[PDB]
Structures are given as C-alpha cells and as structure tokens.
Design a protein around this ligand. Structure first.
Ligand SMILES: [Ca+2]
Ligand SMILES: [Mg+2]
Ligand SMILES: [Mg+2]
Lengths: 803, 154, 144
C-alpha cells in the first residue's frame, strides 16, 4: 500500500519500471573526476577498446582490462546489492550513488547495511516507522538501520546469544549518530512497562543511558576539520537484557582518546567541547569554583585553533551538561570535583617560566597557585617538584630546562585529562551498572581503516584495530558460507578464511612484532627514531612479505614514509618519527605523588599510585578483550560513508566513496565471496529463466536445470548443484544472461519469419492464378491492337456493314 | 546438394517471379527470400540479407543461375522448432497457464526481432484466426502450431 | 476459324472488295474498293497484304490467313474473367493506376506506345477503369 512513511525508504516498483540495454555495448570506464563512467562499446584493437561516453557523448582510450560489467536497468536502486548480476567496484558505486540521490541512504550488501551520510534530518526515525519495522525480516521491508537492530534483538531472543553490532567507517560518516538511533531504538522495543501507573516511575535507566552521552560527548568530542562532534575516541557499548527480553542495564568501554588534543589544536579547530562550556559563564556561581574568566580567547590551551562552532551553543551545552550530570546522580562534590580538575588544566596552559644557567625558574606563581588550589597541593611543592624533579632509583634529582618544563606541564594536562576521562567512563559505567545477566547486544563505534597522505603511530593503532576487526568479518563469513554449502549437500573444503590478515596482524602484535618491539625501545634512554627504525628494519625488513619499502608516490601532495605495511585495504606507508615519544607519555614520577596525595577526593583517586602502561600495551590488552568478546557474539555490520567534503546532501564524490568502499569492508568482503560460489538461483526459479536456453532438452526443477546446464556444455568448475538452490560462479549468470537474450531474439525472429513464410505460401496459389489472368489481358490487347491495325481486317470488317 | 527435381521445382518459383516484375530471366533482389519461402524455406531478413538480398525494390536483379546459390545458402539456416517458439512465448506467460495479453502478442511481434508490420500481423491473426476469448488474452500454444501448419492444413 | 455467321458474310466481303467479280482474289480489288471511305492502300501496302499468302489466295488460301491470324484469341467471357482475377470485391472495375502499372511493369511489359494506344479510349470513370466494358470493346461487342 501507500503509507508515506517509506517516502525516504521505499522506491516505487511500477513508477520505476515505467530502458533499452545492450550487454554487448554498455559498460563502465574509469574516470579521473567521477571514478567511473557509462559508455557504449564500438570496436576492439585487441586488449584496447574504444567507447563512447553517454554523458558528453564522445570517445576515449580504455584497456579492455579496465572496463567493468554493467547491470541492466532492472537493478536500479536495488535494495540488496548481493543480488545484482554484475557486482563490481563500479556496479556498486552506481546503486549507492543512484539510491542516495533519490533520498535513500539505506542499502544492504549481504551482511552489510551501508549508511550514507544524509546531510539533513529525515521522517524515517519516527515512532510510526518503528511499528512497521517491528519483527519484520530484513527482506520483507526496505533496507534501513532499524532493521539491523530489530533483527539483532529478535535473534538474541531466538538464538539465545550475544549479538554484537560493530559500526565502522571514516570520520564524519554517521556512526556516532547511528549508534544512537540503534540505542534510541532498542529502548523503544524493550522498555520497562507500557501496560500496567500514576505514582509509578519516580531516574529511568533509559533517561540515563541517554543522559550519559552528553557528559561524554562533552569530553570525548570536538571540532575538527570534519568537525562533527568528532568522537575523538572509540566506544564499545554493550546493552543487557532480562529473561523476558527487556532492557536491564548497560555499560561503556572506550578506545584511544586523542590525549594529544588537550594541549594543542590545529588550524580552525578547538578542544573537547567542555573547555568551551566552562569559559561560557552559563553557570556563573561556578566561575569562582574553577576560577575562570568566561572568554576562551584567553586560555592558551584552547586559543590555538578557533573557538566558535556554528550549531554549538557552548553556553547551553553546559547547562544541559550539568543537568546531564545531575540526572546521573553526580554528587556536588563530584560534579564540582570534575570542573575543578577541568579548569585546572586551562591554568596549566597559563603558567610560563623564566641562557647559561640552564635550569629554568618560573615567571610568577599566579596560575601555579591556582593549579595548586584547584588540585589541593602545595603551589610551592608543585612548581618546585616540576622545575627540579626527584625520580626514583638512591634516587637522583634530574634537572629540567625552559623547554623541558613546558613539556611536562603539558604532559600533566594530557595525563590528567586522560586519567579524568577514564574515571568518567567508569563512574557512568557505575550508574547504568544497575545490579541484576541474561544476555546482551554490543555496539562498536571506532574509526575505520583510514589511509592518509601522512600515516603515523595514530593511523597505526587504528588500522591495526580495524585490521583485527576486519579479520572478524572474514571469519564470520567463513562459518556462514560453509553452513550454506553443507546445508545444500554441496559442501566444498576451502579453508583460509582470515587470510594474510594474520600475517600483517601478528607482524604487529606478536612477540618479535612491531609494537611488540616499539614497546621495548621505549625503555632505553638515549634511543632516538634512528635507534628505533634500524631495529625495526633489521628484525623484519627483508625478512617478511608484509613489511616492505615505500612505492610510487605519484600523488605530489603526499607525505613522507619509512616502512610500508600490507594491510588489506592497501599497503599503508608509515612514519615512525615520534613513536618513541608518542608511546611512552612521560610525567614527573615525582609530581604524580603530590596529585596522589592531594586533599581533593577526586584528584587523589585519579593518581593513586599502583602501590604494593604504554599506550600500545594498554590498547592491545583492551583489544583482546573486545575481540574475545566480539567472537562470543553474533555480528551485524553497519558500514557508514561520508559523501563529500561539503556537508551537502545529494552530493556524491566517487574518489571518496570508492576510497571508503575499499577500506569499508564491502569490497574485501565481496572478493572473499568471489572464490566461493556467489549468485545462486533456486532450481525452480532457475528452470524458468533459462528453459529457453536448451529447448530440445526438456522432456522438475533440479531435473531441468541439470539438463539445461548439461545442454549448454556447462563447465563443471563453474557451478555446483545445491539441493534447493543452483550455485553459480561470480559473473557466470551474466554470461547465461547475454546468451539468454541473443537466444530469445533469435527464436522470435525464427517465429516472425515463419509467419511471413506462412502468408506468402498462401498468396502463392494466387500469383500462379493471376499470372495467367494477366497472361491473357496483355496478349489479348496486343491482338486487339495488331488486328485493329491490319488490312485484311480493315478490309474484312469493312464489309460486315453489308453482311 | 539439390536433387534435379528439387532444383527443378526451384526453377518454377523463380520463373513465376521473373514474370511478376518483368519476364526477362531476372528477379528483383528484393524478392530473393519471398521466392525462398514459396519453396518451403523460412528465411530471416538477415539470412536473406547476407546472401545478396537487397532492401529496396530496384537496386539489383538476379539471373537464376546466381539466384540459385543465394537459395542453397538459406537452406543451411536455423528454422526454429516448436520448443524454441513455445519457450519464447512462455517467457511472456506470467502465470504459466498458457495465455497472453493480446497487446503482448502484437507488441512482441511488432517490437521484437526487428519487425513485422501491424498490417502483416492483422493479416496472420485474421488469416490463422487466433481470437482472444471474452477476457482479452489467448492461448498462444494453439496459435504457434497454426503459424507452423501453414495456410493449407491436412 | 469463325464458323457460319462470318461464313455467309466473308462471301459478300471479298465479293464486295474484288472489282472484277471472279472469285479469284487480286490487287485490282484493293485499288477501287479502297477509295470507298478513305485512302486506298498504296502499291506497296497492296502487295504486302497479297504476298502474306502463298499460292491461290482467293477464298481458299484466304480462309487460312484469317485462321492463324485470329486463332490466337480468347473469349469475351474468358477475358472478362481474366480481368477479374484482380477483383475480389467484385466491383466489376479495377482501379486505373493499378491496371496501368499492371500492364506497364509486370509480365510482357507494355512500352509507352502499346500503353498510349490502349488507354487511348479505355472505359474509365472517376478512377475506376471498367474492365468489363473495355472487354466488349476489344472483342467487337462494345463501342470499339
Ligand atoms: Ca524480372
Ligand atoms: Mg563521532
Ligand atoms: Mg479479285
């Protein structure tokens, strides 16, 4: 029916069907400023075709090895892409680009369900739509993110098992807002009570799972060049249900926060929103409690990049934030303890110090005094412990210089804020951690396998995870395909599901491995980048195939590199320059004490010294958890993709999308199915589409298919006989299609002709007659002319008058 | 490999056509296949087109001695069988109970292959006599056989 | 050849052409009889119509010249139909241009002349050329 609640979801079947397609002509040709292009095949000088561009209607040179198969029109804006006859890098960029432009942003691809970034709100998430998606099987209803979730849940209940929902994707792809809509959904279909009260709901865990996101987005988000509320950190957020199938409790778990952000901010950027909500005078009573003067322009740790953000009201987000803290039960001591700790960072950026006398002095205590008050420590004990630290051993008393000090003041903030954030996840984790375990549904939202101009230790951590998380899908796929084949008595014994992923993975995490190395080279004083690299190269350079050296940099505006890694999405060149620093983040093993022995309940908790920790070692450790977990789940995959650098709706950009599609998973996901047997009809639906391809063979289903196939001299290593479905090797349905068509026309022409023959044969019996008839006429008119012109007659019929 | 009688019967056609456009030992190329059908063959524009056939009336003529080969050529051609036909119509049969939208039939016939002129169509439908029942569709199966039985039955 | 109606006719014909009344056909006949309603054939044309017959052409060798001269003829009924194998509606008339092309481009093709001569008087009327009348014509029954 026509329920205008599918407007931005469905796509009219009839009104869509309302062209002519030449398989032998229509194809796709690479394009420098559009990725691909429609065209018509003209000629072939072997391994080099020539074709016309439907667009500007012209001609160009294309190696017959670069053209890619084009699907007929009957696969226009096709709900599920794992069904198109020709599934290629371009055939997809079309259905994705085609759909997205009509308004649609929800397209499946087997397990996947890609979400393109609409740059405008839509009717699809309203409660009424939700009733429509309730329980319905993915097929029986337009692609959409609600289906991905409603299914998980339905499966959790049915299958009785941990359903996970990893959402990956580039920066500004929509994952953050999506993880919400999946969360703002699950709630709507697994809430407390909607049947049997006035003084009932006195808070609501829903209100909390929700009200939490603000306190976080406040410290985890920020404005970057692709400035969404950039989830500058990754978050795994499980959801727990009860033995009736209802939301019980939840919890957080985060990965890699941009600590390097607290103290620096690139061109046209800021710091986590919070610093801009404090200096907002949205809540004056507190300006004193923190000791700040409501103008960002002032504070050095935040007046590096810009300050303002179009849609963000730093002075409103604070108000809500506070409320947010309250609706969570944060005690004033706490809520305030946090701000003290937060404001105290701004002040650190406001502490400057004063050729030969190497050791530096301070240039006033003002802020140092404010940093001490805010942290409850001796301003003297602090400034003194900084300029002249006393790290353990008969400990020594190392000295610091003007630079060495500014460097630690920053490490202070960087390491506080990070300590801070952690504590915050823990605390909320505490709230929502209602005491009650049936099962659960997790959701992942970390960056994606992103390759850039300049790739360093950060890109490394990230691509590594996705590397690990990709290997996840591969395996998932594995088990799944196998089940199919076996379920169809067609079982094949292929194996290597997660391929060289292991190579490049272990070559990073395993013993001799990179980080494995990196983590040791951090505990060796006089060791610089050169020190690193040589060992990095020795150990593996030349000794492995996944570790090589930089290639052809034909992209002029590229960045340096040292080594290069063979990651699935592409061999990513890297640049160790820094790592030793970036990994072992310092701090005064001396000043930490103070902060641990502060008088403020919080700060103290923050720096309690493991009594009776490198970025990499932590992450790797917290990653096995995630993985160990994910494998104890039932995956679902939501692939998000940004369409352009302009936040403009309907504006695609092939370089980007493709770019994404490769490291996205939809590609390396497609090719992993290639080696198996993709496209597969059912021996009936089949026997009805090609029974015209072997007419003389037919005297059911698997009987005829077994005959039309054989009847076509079909190559064995090309198809396999299922027990309900006929399996086909990638693109072989494309051949039986073209073949099918040429054959239909031929058969119709035969008929047509036979008709013409029919007629003529009939008009034959007459031309034989008429001929004679005209044989007379013509001849008998000659006689009439000859005779009426003679003499013996003009002299014979000249007497009749008297006869 | 024409028998002297088969080739003997071939003369006869060529002779009646040489006449209907001018008794002069020749036959407008544009009849090549209309002459071929008269003997039993079931050519296709292309078939005929590929052996010397022309498009318009009066662009070439054919002495029988050269017209002959033109014919033997079209004897080694595809002359589609019942099963071929059927399956071609079957693809249009939506339900499977053997029936087609009167338009379809005409549509198919005039829109598929290259052509068949509506006139030519009305001629065969009226000729063969395939009429759509009170609904507006028809059993093409019992029609094909007609177009195949030929003007004169058994 | 023409049985009895022309039999009792042919008699008085040659008899009413031949000036010396001897039963033996000569050339003095086609010399004085001719100027009866036109121009007598001139010397050459007189010998041509008398040479066409070998031996005594005097109503013996003469009843054999008209024989093979007309023998190749067909009925007033046979042609009336012949023209009809092109009238399945039976309008007793073939269109004009159709018949013109029909005599002009198919079969023993007529040349500008033969044609000019035919339709010179052809029974046409508003597009419909009357084959039925034209027929009576060519035979003799019609208005010739
Ligand atoms: Ca001719
Ligand atoms: Mg985000
Ligand atoms: Mg005489």
């Amino acid at each position: 029916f026509s329920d205008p609640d599918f407007q931005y979801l469905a796509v009219d079947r009839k009104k869509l069907m309302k062209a002519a397609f030449d398989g032998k002509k229509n194809c796709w040709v690479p394009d420098e400023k559009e990725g691909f292009a429609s065209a018509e095949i003209q000629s072939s000088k072997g391994d080099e075709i020539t074709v016309k561009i439907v667009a500007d209607s012209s001609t160009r040179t294309v190696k017959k090895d670069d053209i890619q198969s084009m699907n007929p029109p009957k696969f226009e804006k096709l709900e599920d892409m794992a069904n198109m006859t020709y599934l290629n890098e371009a055939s997809v960029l079309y259905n994705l680009r085609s759909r997205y432009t009509s308004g649609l942003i929800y397209t499946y691809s087997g397990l996947f369900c890609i979400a393109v970034n609409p740059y405008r709100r839509l009717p699809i998430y309203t409660d009424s739509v939700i009733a429509k998606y309730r329980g319905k099987r993915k097929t029986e209803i337009p692609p959409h993110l609600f289906s991905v979730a409603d299914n998980a849940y339905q499966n959790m209940v049915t299958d009785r098992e941990n359903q996970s929902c990893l959402i990956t994707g580039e920066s500004g792809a929509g994952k953050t807002e999506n993880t919400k809509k999946v969360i703002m959904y699950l709630a709507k279909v697994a809430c407390a009570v909607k049947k049997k009260e006035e003084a009932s709901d006195k808070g609501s865990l829903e209100d909390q799972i929700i009200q939490a996101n603000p306190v976080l987005e406040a410290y985890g988000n920020a404005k970057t060049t692709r400035n969404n509320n950039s989830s500058r950190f990754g978050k795994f957020i499980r959801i727990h249900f009860g033995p009736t199938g209802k939301i019980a409790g939840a919890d957080i778990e985060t990965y890699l926060l941009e600590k390097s952000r607290v103290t620096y901010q690139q061109s046209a950027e800021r710091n986590y929103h919070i610093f801009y909500q404090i200096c907002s005078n949205a809540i004056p009573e507190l300006n004193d409690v923190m000791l700040v003067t409501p103008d960002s322009g002032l504070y050095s740790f935040i007046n590096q990049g810009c300050l303002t953000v179009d849609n963000i009201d730093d002075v409103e987000e604070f108000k809500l934030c506070d409320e947010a803290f309250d609706i969570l039960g944060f005690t004033k001591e706490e809520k305030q303890s946090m701000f003290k700790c937060t404001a105290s960072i701004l002040h650190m950026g406001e502490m400057k110090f004063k050729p030969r006398e190497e050791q530096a002095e301070s240039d006033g205590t003002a802020e140092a005094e404010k940093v001490a008050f805010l942290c409850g420590i001796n301003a003297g004990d602090l400034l003194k412990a900084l300029l002249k630290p006393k790290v353990k051993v008969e400990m020594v008393t190392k000295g610091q210089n003007m630079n060495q000090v500014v460097n630690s003041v920053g490490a202070l903030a960087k390491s506080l804020y990070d300590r801070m954030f952690n504590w915050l996840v823990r605390r909320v984790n505490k709230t929502l951690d209602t005491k009650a375990r049936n099962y659960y549904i997790g959701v992942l939202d970390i960056a994606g396998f992103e390759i850039f101009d300049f790739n360093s230790f950060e890109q490394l951590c990230i691509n590594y995870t996705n590397e690990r998380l990709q290997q996840f899908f591969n395996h998932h796929m594995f088990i799944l395909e196998q089940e199919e084949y076996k379920k169809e008595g067609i079982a094949w014994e292929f194996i290597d599901f997660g391929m060289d992923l292991q190579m490049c993975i272990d070559l990073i995490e395993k013993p001799m491995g990179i980080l494995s190395i990196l983590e040791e080279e951090c505990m060796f004083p006089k060791a610089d980048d050169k020190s690193f690299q040589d060992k990095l190269y020795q150990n593996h350079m030349g000794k492995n195939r996944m570790f090589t050296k930089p290639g052809k940099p034909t992209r002029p505006n590229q960045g340096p590199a040292h080594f290069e890694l063979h990651h699935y999405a592409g061999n990513v060149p890297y640049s160790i320059t820094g790592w030793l620093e970036k990994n072992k983040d310092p701090i005064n093993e001396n000043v930490v004490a103070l902060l641990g022995a502060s008088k403020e309940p919080l700060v103290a908790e923050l720096f309690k010294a493991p009594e009776e920790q490198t970025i990499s070692a932590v992450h790797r450790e917290s990653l096995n958890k995630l993985m160990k977990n994910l494998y104890s789940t039932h995956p679902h995959f939501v692939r998000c993709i940004i369409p352009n650098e302009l936040k403009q709706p309907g504006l695609v950009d092939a370089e980007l999308v493709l770019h994404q599609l490769q490291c996205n998973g939809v590609l390396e996901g497609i090719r992993i199915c290639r080696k198996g047997f993709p496209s597969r009809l059912i021996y009936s639906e089949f026997k009805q589409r090609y029974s015209i391809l072997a007419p003389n063979a037919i005297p059911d289903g698997k009987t005829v298919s077994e005959k039309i196939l054989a009847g076509l001299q079909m190559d064995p290593a090309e198809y396999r006989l299922g027990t309900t479905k006929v399996f086909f090797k990638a693109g072989v349905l494309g051949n039986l299609e073209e073949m099918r068509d040429e054959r239909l026309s031929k058969i119709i022409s035969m008929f047509q002709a036979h008709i013409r023959g029919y007629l003529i044969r009939k008009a034959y019996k007459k031309l034989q007659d008429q001929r004679i008839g005209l044989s007379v006429i013509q001849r008998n008119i000659r006689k009439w002319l000859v005779l009426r012109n003679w003499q013996w007659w003009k002299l014979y019929s000249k007497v009749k008058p008297l006869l | 490999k024409l028998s002297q009688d088969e080739i003997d019967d071939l003369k006869d056609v060529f002779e009646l056509f040489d006449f209907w456009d001018g008794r002069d030992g020749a036959v407008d190329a544009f009849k090549l296949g209309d002459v071929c059908r008269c003997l039993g063959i079931n050519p296709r524009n292309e078939d005929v087109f590929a052996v010397g056939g022309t498009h318009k009336m009066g662009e070439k003529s054919l002495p029988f001695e050269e017209f002959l080969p033109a014919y033997e050529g079209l004897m080694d051609c595809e002359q589609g069988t019942f099963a071929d036909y059927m399956e071609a119509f079957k693809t249009f049969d939506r339900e499977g109970q053997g029936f087609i939208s009167g338009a379809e039939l005409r549509h198919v016939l005039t829109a598929l292959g290259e052509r068949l002129s509506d006139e030519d169509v009305d001629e065969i439908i009226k000729l063969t006599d395939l009429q759509e029942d009170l609904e507006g569709n028809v059993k093409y199966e019992d029609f094909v056989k007609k177009v195949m039985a030929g003007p004169y039955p058994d | 050849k023409l049985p009895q109606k022309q039999i009792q006719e042919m008699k008085e014909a040659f008899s009413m052409i031949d000036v010396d009344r001897d039963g033996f056909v000569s050339k003095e006949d086609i010399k004085a009889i001719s100027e009866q309603l036109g121009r007598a054939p001139d010397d050459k044309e007189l010998t041509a119509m008398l040479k066409e017959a070998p031996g005594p052409l005097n109503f013996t060798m003469f009843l054999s010249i008209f024989s093979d001269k007309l023998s190749g003829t067909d009925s007033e009924e046979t042609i009336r139909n012949a023209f009809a194998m092109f009238d399945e509606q039976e309008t007793k008339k073939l269109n004009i241009e159709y018949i013109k092309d029909l005599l002009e481009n198919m079969g023993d093709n007529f040349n500008k002349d033969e044609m000019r001569m035919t339709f010179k008087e052809a029974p046409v009327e508003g597009g419909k050329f009357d084959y039925v009348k034209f027929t009576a014509m060519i035979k003799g029954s019609g208005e010739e």
